[PDB]
């Protein structure tokens, strides 16, 4: 018996309840990035960069 | 018996309840990116970059 | 018995309930990208980049 | 202008999300009453008795 | 302007999220009453008795 | 302007989130009453007795 890498559980979300009562919600953007409202998200990345709510700017590599 | 990589569970979302009561919701954009409202999302990436709510800017590589 | 890569479960979403009562919802865009309202999404990518709600800007590679 | 009994809201249920993951569920009865699983119920009774999940016994009025 | 009995809100339930993960659930009865699992219930009774999860016994009025 | 009985709010439940993870749940009864699991319940009774989770015994009025 080996059971190598067995019965695992990774990058998991479960059993979540959520209520949101918002009368108004404005998001104005005129520049770079804006990220909002990220709920119950799961990921598993192998041999790579893993981002989930990454608001980056502008990569301005010139000459 | 090996059971190598067995009974696994990865990048999973389950058992989620959500209520959202919003009277108004405006999103104005005139520049780069805007990401909103990302719920119950799962991913598994192998040998690659994995992004989920990544609002990037503008990659301006000149000469 | 090997059971290598067996009974797996990856990039999965299940058992999700959602209610959304929004009286008004406007999205104005005049620049780059806008992503909204992404619910119960699953993906598995092998040997590749995997994006799910990625609002990118404009890749302006000149000469 | 009277607006007597106006814009009322009574005996109301709205905006409800629910998830139930039950692997087994047995209900054995051999006597009186059993009531189970009552969700999102509304009632308005006028000039009367109003019951909603009332498990009564046995009304044994003899001579 | 009277607005007598106006813009009222009574016996109301709203904006409820619920998750229940039960592996087993047995209810055995052999006598009187059993009431279980009553969620998001609303009532308005006028000129009457109002019960919602009332498990009564046995009304044994003899001679 | 009277606004008598106006903009009221009575017997109300709202904005409730709940998670319940129970591996086992048994309810055995052989006598009178049993009441369990009463969530997010509202009532308004006028000119009457109002009970919500009332487990009574057995009213044995003899001669």
A-facing residues of E in 8-27 (CB < 8 A) are: 15-19, 21
Q: CA of B11, closest CA in chain D: separation in Å?
A: 20
Record the tokens describing residue F31, joined without a space: 């006598």
**Which residues pair with residue A38 across a beta bridge?**
B38
Record the tokens describing residue D35, joined without a space: 């009531």
How many CB atoms are closer than 10 A to CB D5?
11
Q: Can you spell out the DSSP letters for A1-52?
A: ---TTBS--EEEEEEEEEEEEES--EEEESSS--EEEEEEEEEEEESS-EES
Do the Cβ atoms of C19 and D18 come within 8 Å? no
Residue of A nearest to B5 (CA): A5
Give the residue from D1, D2, D5, D10 with the most E CB atoms within 10 Å of its CB, the best one to mutate: D10
The rounded distance, in Å, linking the Cα atoms of C5 and E21 is 28
Question: Binding site for Cu cation, residues of A?
Answer: 14
Q: Do chains E and F touch (3 or more CB pairs under 8 A)?
A: yes
Record the tokens describing residue C27, joined without a space: 């999205």
**Which residues pair with residue A12 across a beta bridge?**
B12
**CA angle, corner E26, sides to E22 and E28, nearest 5?**
160
- Non-local (6+) Cβ contacts of F5 within 8 A are E4, E5, E6, E8
Residue in D15, D19, D21 nearest the CB of B19: D15
Do the Cβ atoms of D57 and E56 come within 8 Å? yes
Answer yes or no: is B51 a known binding residue: no
Q: CA of B33, closest CA in chain C: separation in Å?
A: 5
Query: What DSSP designation does A55 have?
Result: -
Integer CA distances (angstroms), E24 to C36, E36, F28, in order: 39, 14, 14
Q: Could you tell me the resolution of this structure in angstroms?
A: 2.8
Do the Cβ atoms of A16 and E19 come within 8 Å? yes
Residue in D10, D49, D57 nearest the CB of F58: D57
- Non-local (6+) Cβ contacts of B51 within 8 A are A50, A51, A52, A54, C49, C50, C51, C52, C54
Do the Cβ atoms of D19 and B19 come within 8 Å? no
- State which H helix or E strand residue E58 sits in: none
The rounded distance, in Å, linking the Cα atoms of E6 and F8 is 8
């Amino acid at each position: 018996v080996l059971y190598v890498g067995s019965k695992t559980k990774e990058g998991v979300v479960h059993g979540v309840a959520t209520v949101a009562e918002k009368t108004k919600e404005q998001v104005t953007n005129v520049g770079g990035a804006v990220v909002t409202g990220v709920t119950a998200v799961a990921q598993k990345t192998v041999e790579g960069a893993g981002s989930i709510a990454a608001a980056t700017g502008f990569v301005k590599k010139d000459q």
